[PDB]
Design an enzyme around this catalytic site. Structure first.
Site, mmCIF file in Angstrom:
data_model
loop_
_atom_site.group_PDB
_atom_site.id
_atom_site.type_symbol
_atom_site.label_atom_id
_atom_site.label_comp_id
_atom_site.label_asym_id
_atom_site.label_seq_id
_atom_site.Cartn_x
_atom_site.Cartn_y
_atom_site.Cartn_z
ATOM 1 N N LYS A 263 7.970 -23.121 17.554
ATOM 2 C CA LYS A 263 7.763 -22.689 16.174
ATOM 3 C C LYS A 263 7.040 -23.801 15.449
ATOM 4 C CE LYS A 263 8.922 -18.578 14.971
ATOM 5 N NZ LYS A 263 7.860 -17.626 14.548
ATOM 6 N N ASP B 147 2.847 -15.616 11.690
ATOM 7 C CA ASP B 147 4.177 -15.456 11.112
ATOM 8 C C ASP B 147 4.019 -15.301 9.594
ATOM 9 O OD1 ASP B 147 7.384 -17.254 11.487
ATOM 10 O OD2 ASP B 147 6.900 -15.235 10.805
#
Lengths: 409, 409, 409, 409, 409
Positions: C101, C141
């Site tokens: 991430k 995202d």
């Protein structure tokens, strides 16, 4: 064309020596020529495509070496020719380099700092495929300086993934550069001038020198010859007129004067003479460090100088060469004389590779050491072939390059 | 020049669509142009230097794709032009490739197998700096075949340090090649011919076809149209003359006839007619798969063909285009029609990357699938802009390339 | 902290299975955490430094997979937790990926297109050192889309020296993306919903479904369940209110309505109900595809839904979990339900590696195939441990990751 | 020596076909042989040096493929011979692989898990210089399994700097392996047996089969032959003795019996017979999947089997070959018969390259597809040269490798 | 926090010079911070995870340089701060290095030789991704020595695939190290002490020196100052107490005494005085080479020393600085004084690059040469800004780093 002209000169020396025909061909033709059309985002958001080139003539002796030009009038032909010259220039100095040159067709004066930076970065990103510390090492030239060179170095490093700083020479001192870079070319002319006096049996202390032009080359030349050799610099000339004085000028004052006053003209205690008049002065050494074709057919017959130390490129025309040689006037070839610049760039490259930098003195000693060597090496060939020193220089260069190619295969 | 002419055609379609001026420039100019002068040792021990080129026009959509030429008359300009076309050709077929082309100025007929091999190896070793399975993938073209391509593949693999086989396409089947390679081009022409019949409401079973030329494209096209589409191939022509027969020819016999007799001329049950005459035949589909400018000003007015499926490159001159379009005669653009070759090379590249090879059927299905797709995609643009199918194809290609560049930055 | 909370959930499942203590520790702690402070030149010539992060929790099963966030409120802790989740999310789906991430502390709304691009490129240039198609593959995202991802892809390719396109997923279709990307998440929910019905013995034709939320997930989820499963979508809710109708809504009309009217509220033939009311609807399947904590303590006791297919992240609070499980209400865990997005990104990566792209149908089949598989795999574990399906999913994930680490060493 | 003996067999087939003498020599001699002496830290703190080898015989057709052995009695000669075989084994199957083999002189039974791991890691770290997914792909063999192979994969990946998993085959399924790995070899024997029946006009339903040996090959072969082909497995033998029964054994029960009781001996409803006797059984097909030289001079004359499908390596001695062929008894060569193992490792490598894995069925179909192909291809050569199928297989292998080398240069 | 405190000092000097605000920010924030959680197999077979860090503050001037710490109390903040300092420390010395630092939270005293080695190797294997001879070159620090450093060098070389030895400094002499390593720091103090005397017009022969602390720094400093400068070392203090004697101590005997007797205390012919008393001695030069905050508020007013040469880090508190400067007492900043250690590590790295090693004398000459240079450089800035020498040193450092960043872009 300009390239073909260069090749023609090569052919002369090539004929003087028994060089294998089939081999000569590989020496004439350049290894690589890369032409790139790259987009650059202008400040006003519009994209503009520029044309750039990079030519590696010969890599036989080592990694291609050569500067990059920023000029609106730049033809591939010009690049090829200059690259061709580099090969012989490095060879004559006996440096482990090849021949290269590059340039982008652009007028830097119409571009803003930012646009220039972006253009330089995109350019170096484009020819990156072919360059490298052990492949092709660019350097500054027309309209490119330490600042532009620094961008190059930075762009390469950031692209590759680590600090390189050996990808280009002529970088700022406090960023990988070498000391003595500025005076380099001038010191070369100084050494050659001295040795020229030696073979002519002229005592430097009594020697009279006349320098045509007062740019980087002219200034440092006139300065070092004066201070280090003791020769009396009787006259210098700006791109407007020259000044004369048999008593000898104080070069330092002349440089300061020009810095505070655009030209050395009007300088007190100096009889004003035209540039054409300076070339015909009755002096021991004439150092033409200004424009091309300075010494041409008309001047040739009337040049009272005992020796000509070509501080600039092509000051003496081929026609003039024949006559000067006929008259017994020694003409130290530019490829040897002003090679000082390249000699120091080599030292910079070296220092960079080992990340350890030498101090001024060391650079100076190394520069002069190699200069004396190259000079003597050329003279040996001169005597052996009984030709003009220029031709001798070309023979030596061609010979060395041929050897490497033969031994390699 | 040839390149400028190509550029001109680009400008037409570029004007029909609101393409940003600044952007258009980047699409016109080629990214890289590499010119190499490389020595090759001839059988008689003498070295000979050859001139080679490799041009990557645009890489926006993916790795540059393009063949290599071996021909004594090959100018950089020719290469640039062909590379320029490649970009649009790949784009129209919707393949993840860019545009590239290369060539060496050499007459292979004057070189022996060994010399040829050495030349090929040295060439690929020279342009290696710029090529790569993810950068530039060469392929065969004029005077270069699977054998030459194999040397390339071998030279790259041995140079890099491992088997690559994806560095070039058109390799021997039992060495990384793909099945269907030969018929590829012809099958493309077959698909387009079928779809053309569909848009013209012509029933293939009754459809009459005339093919000019009997090379790779001509033979496979004529054969597949016949067998798979059922259309009656009434005439074919060799580079000496043609034969006509309304009853239809048994293409298989014709191919065999040409293999045993240099030309299809003289073939029994075939009324001899000239090539120019063949073009003027009263047939539904005319497939010109021979030379350039076949269909020109003079012919244009007298062409009774309902549709022209350009099997070759530039069979119809621009002058003829205007006339044909004016007369409502459909002209399927070459970039779409003969693209079958490139489409299969793509499949080869794919198979190589994953080292798994597809069988004939699969290749055929995939080839036809993409052909129908590209056809329809071109038609959509055709209707949207109400222009000649050729122009439409170019618009589509230019559009796709522009999108990628925009999205990328 | 958010990270610690995630770890806590891990510990639960870790205790249910005899996981070696010393090993558990390596599974908790992330492998790498890269924090970068990078300058970005703003349009007004002033430089501004931004903080960015990239965390690769575990690479045991394969290259780290995870999206990048652009948000002013982004703490390293948030990233670590999200990365932690990725590990188990990929593992449960049985994908050859790890957990990663990243994010940059910045408010995109205060930056102009140009500034955003530059920030995106410099960010990717900074974390490049750690990413790679076989190391770490970023994805979109919060506040990052195909456009931003495209810049990444381009930045990497130009930096490395060749077209990569497998360095990031979620790219534009005509630039390396995969079809079915949009509906991916929804289709996952669709499959889960169907299987949930199957285990409950509910006939989809008669099945009633309610969807809290109408974003990307909710829309496609509802639509697909409707058209493909035949279940009556009785209610949906916008981020303002919801609409109910036992007759069943025509999802297509609803979508268009929302597209032409910011909210599905006011839609004719729909009895207005509040979001809290929707969750309490007497429906067979409740698909919460809106916000976190939707189903909490208060709601838990009053939910008449037979099964809950978590279309969003953390819709049901842990407190609610205990109650729902106690009541026998099946809750399909989000990591399994919405995993469809990740599953397709995998397929994109695959297609990229071999540069051959699959058509929509293929992607759909492959996505559903793996979903059914993952579902059943979780069910097996559920039965074996006699726990909540969510816990089971975590056990399976932890199990798979542990095996790889053990076998590797 | 063992190598020389292998070479001798090659020479036979090499004489049958007009293979260029100078070329044959390159095919006999191995490209690379790497011998390494590496230290390994034993659990008791003392260092111990081991001898390891890795030989790449031929890479002409593709990356070298071959297993690694852990055995105290392993001579370089053994490795060279085995590598030599690999080249022809891959070639006959028509796989894009070369020939390789390796081994470490060590008795694993004297080493503890830890010591073994360290040894395996150090070994792979040593031969790393020569291996690679596109250079040399090792695999398991004597005393090496998925677990050891996993360490290899892990060591390579960690050394190179990214997950590779294509560096070795025979890895755990949940770590890059492929399904069908175990049954692979047996399935090959099954296909060959079927095809053998086909060429002999024997109906499988009535066909009787006797299998010497009950290891991985024997079990799976017997099982599949029975279930998929329907042939009556009337006898199987353990490394202690065999059991006979004309009624046909229920292979499954036999397998479970052996798993619960070290040998198949003593199994009820089975007339106990010696291994030598089993080979002389009046059965249609004899599948020797046990030891070398099983079928030798003495047996040859008394073998009532119509066809012999060599499940193991060298079951039939050359002496026996002459006799069997003379008697008209078909002997399916081991290089073709048990090649199934290699064929699947190829599939594994493929799946690894694209990171997408195939399901069991796909692997099975692909495995049998290639087996039937290879079989028929060998048959064609057999008829063309009118020789023993084994010799034919060698000719085909030699031919294919020769072609690649010729075309490459 | 410690980092913020360091930053605060930076801000001071940053305000004294017109440093562009936007630029200042990039100089404050660190480029990279890598946090790794790595497993290490303990002797008793159990795995234990450790936390390690590596921070590269600034690379503008060259590859990041900085030591690695092994200590149970090591916060990322401490690392960042130390890295921050390194940037200014290398810059002041004018070395082509950046700023870096690293550490692992572990108490080496609880680990056995083996465990330590394994930890060191795994650590270097983890930060490897970010380090490199041209990226980041680690070095020893707290709880890390030549032995640990050697493991690093070995780990890198073995991982990369060739002997590097330039990846870390402070290696064993007979393994890539440099001579003079030990005395380095002390010699620096020696040079600074001498120059301090010079600016104060103090004759070294008569000069009195007092050294607080007798560690590596204190010992060599006292010895060299005595022997090489001729200054009378009247007092030295151990970490227990100090000894005074106006006649001058024979440093050699003192060192031998401390080696044979834990402390220099009790040493005959030495009036015992407390460390606090030593600082207040009426001596010309005070060399505090012990602990931080030695010279603080209370001491400041009563310090009779004419000059303070900070042999250790932060001996004088900021409060004391103001007072000392107010009193006209010269305080040579530690970043300049003890920089000798880094100066020699540079030399080591140099020698490593070219694999040629210099003899002791050369090292000494180069070390002192650079020291005198750095000193004078700082003095120039001191006079130009009329501030405390420490502040001047910081200005110089910040200036140099700023220039590089500006020129680079």
């Amino acid at each position: 064309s300009l390239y073909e002209m260069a090749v023609e000169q090569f052919n002369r020396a090539a004929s003087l020596m028994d060089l294998e025909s089939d081999l000569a061909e590989v020496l004439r033709r350049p290894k690589r020529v890369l032409i790139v059309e790259f987009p650059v985002r202008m400040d006003d958001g519009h994209v503009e495509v520029f044309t750039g080139y990079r030519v590696q003539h010969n890599v036989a002796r080592g990694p291609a070496k050569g500067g990059i030009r920023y000029h609106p009038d730049v033809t591939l032909d010009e690049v090829k020719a200059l690259a061709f010259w580099m090969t012989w220039k490095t060879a004559v100095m006996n440096l482990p380099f090849g021949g290269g040159k590059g340039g982008v067709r652009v007028d830097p004066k119409k571009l803003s700092r930012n646009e220039l930076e972006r253009l330089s970065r995109r350019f170096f990103s484009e020819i990156q495929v072919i360059i490298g510390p052990y492949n092709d090492i660019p350097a500054p030239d027309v309209n490119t300086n330490a600042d532009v060179i620094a961008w190059y170095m930075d762009t390469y490093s950031m692209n590759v993934g680590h600090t390189v700083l050996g990808i280009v020479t002529g970088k700022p001192v406090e960023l990988g550069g070498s000391k003595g870079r500025e005076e380099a070319t001038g010191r070369g002319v100084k050494v050659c001038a001295g040795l020229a006096m030696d073979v002519l049996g002229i005592d430097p202390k009594k020697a009279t020198v006349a320098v045509q032009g007062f740019g980087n080359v002219g200034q440092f030349a006139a300065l070092l010859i004066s201070q280090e050799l003791g020769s009396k610099v009787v006259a210098v000339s700006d791109s407007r007129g020259g000044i004369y004085n048999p008593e000898g000028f104080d070069v330092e004052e002349l440089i300061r004067y020009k810095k505070e006053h655009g030209t050395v003209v009007t300088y007190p205690k100096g009889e004003r003479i035209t540039n054409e008049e300076l070339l015909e002065l009755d002096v021991d050494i004439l150092v033409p460090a200004a424009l091309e074709g300075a010494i041409h057919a008309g001047n040739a017959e009337r040049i009272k100088a005992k020796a000509v130390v070509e501080g600039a490129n092509g000051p003496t025309t081929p026609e003039a060469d024949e006559i000067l040689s006929r008259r017994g006037i020694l003409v130290v070839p530019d490829i040897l004389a002003n090679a000082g610049g390249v000699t120091v760039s080599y030292f910079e490259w070296v220092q960079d590779l080992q990340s350890f930098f030498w101090d001024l003195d060391q650079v100076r000693n190394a520069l002069e050491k190699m200069m004396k060597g190259a000079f003597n090496d050329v003279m040996k060939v001169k005597e052996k072939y009984n030709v003009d020193m220029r031709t001798a220089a070309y023979i030596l260069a061609i010979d060395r390059v041929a050897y490497a190619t033969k031994k390699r295969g």
